[PDB]
């Protein structure tokens, strides 16, 4: 994420790495919405246009991640996706609509001080925070600056950032893409005079808010797209983890826990 601060030990035990096994690399961030279930950004895994397309087989999932580099020995978790699940109405062709996906950790992940779920919004929670200027914080390992590459490449540790939902009207006019009442835009604006943005490979990463009600941590989004990274004039775009809360639901009780 552009213009951020580096996270802390435990500040996000739900962050999960989207680690293709080979090219032994990284392509996303996902979150722990269970003991054994994971969700993410659509495109993270199904993208024809760039012959993007995967399978449980291809990739491997990691947890307990402070450093993006090393092999966090006795803190990190690593499981294999038992099955993936895309949103049968996904749009790789249109505007990354329902940009959402989930992955039944093939086996069950036991929690600890670095791995602890996020909770799915309830229309109230979904209703109390989801709104103008009400900051929300994005996490991640992505690209420190607009598309390029220890240096302005990528961080050693997990970058944390916080941002203000934007005005739907304005959301819809920093772009030219048909945007859906399923997607929301985060990010400080121009004069607002501050910076912060999620960037390359930040995707499928969370937009969890703090519910002042039960002070519980709740994931309002799934990082989807944007036009660059921190450019005076537009904001990223995220997924209403809720509109689609229907689904997330529907398929977890059809194939898992």
């Amino acid at each position: 994420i552009v213009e951020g601060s580096d996270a802390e030990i435990g500040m996000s035990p739900w962050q999960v790495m989207l680690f293709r096994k080979s090219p032994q690399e990284l392509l996303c961030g996902a979150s722990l919405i269970s003991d054994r279930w994971v969700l993410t950004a659509a495109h993270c895994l199904l993208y024809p246009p760039w012959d993007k397309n995967f399978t449980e087989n291809d990739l491997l999932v990691r947890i307990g991640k402070h450093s993006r580099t090393r092999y966090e020995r006795n803190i990190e978790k690593i499981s294999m996706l038992e099955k993936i699940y895309i949103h049968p109405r996904y749009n790789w062709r249109e505007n990354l609509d329902r940009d959402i996906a989930l992955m039944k950790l093939k086996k069950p992940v036991a929690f600890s001080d670095y791995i602890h779920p996020v909770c799915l919004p309830d229309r109230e929670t979904a209703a109390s925070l989801l709104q103008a200027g009400y900051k929300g914080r994005v996490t991640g390992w992505g690209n420190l600056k607009e598309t390029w590459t220890v240096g302005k490449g990528q961080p050693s540790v997990l970058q944390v950032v916080n941002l203000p939902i934007v005005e739907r009207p304005v959301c819809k006019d920093s772009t030219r893409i048909r945007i859906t009442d399923n997607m929301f835009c985060a990010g400080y604006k121009p004069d607002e005079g501050k910076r912060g943005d999620a960037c390359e490979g930040d995707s499928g990463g969370p937009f969890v808010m703090k519910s002042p009600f039960n002070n519980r941590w709740y994931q309002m989004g799934i990082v989807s797209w944007g036009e660059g990274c921190d450019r005076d004039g537009k904001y990223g775009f995220y997924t209403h983890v809720f509109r689609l809360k229907k689904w997330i639901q529907k398929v977890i009780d059809q194939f898992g826990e």
């Binding site: 495109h43 760039w50 990354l96 992505g142 598309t147 390029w148 943005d197 999620a198 960037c199 390359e200 930040d202 995707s203 990082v223 797209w225 944007g226 036009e227 660059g228 990274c229 990223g236």
Partner: peptide, 10 residues
């Protein structure tokens, strides 16, 4: 697309 950039990675 992705935040990245139509055209792939850089």
């Amino acid at each position: 697309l992705d935040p990245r950039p139509k055209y792939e990675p850089f």
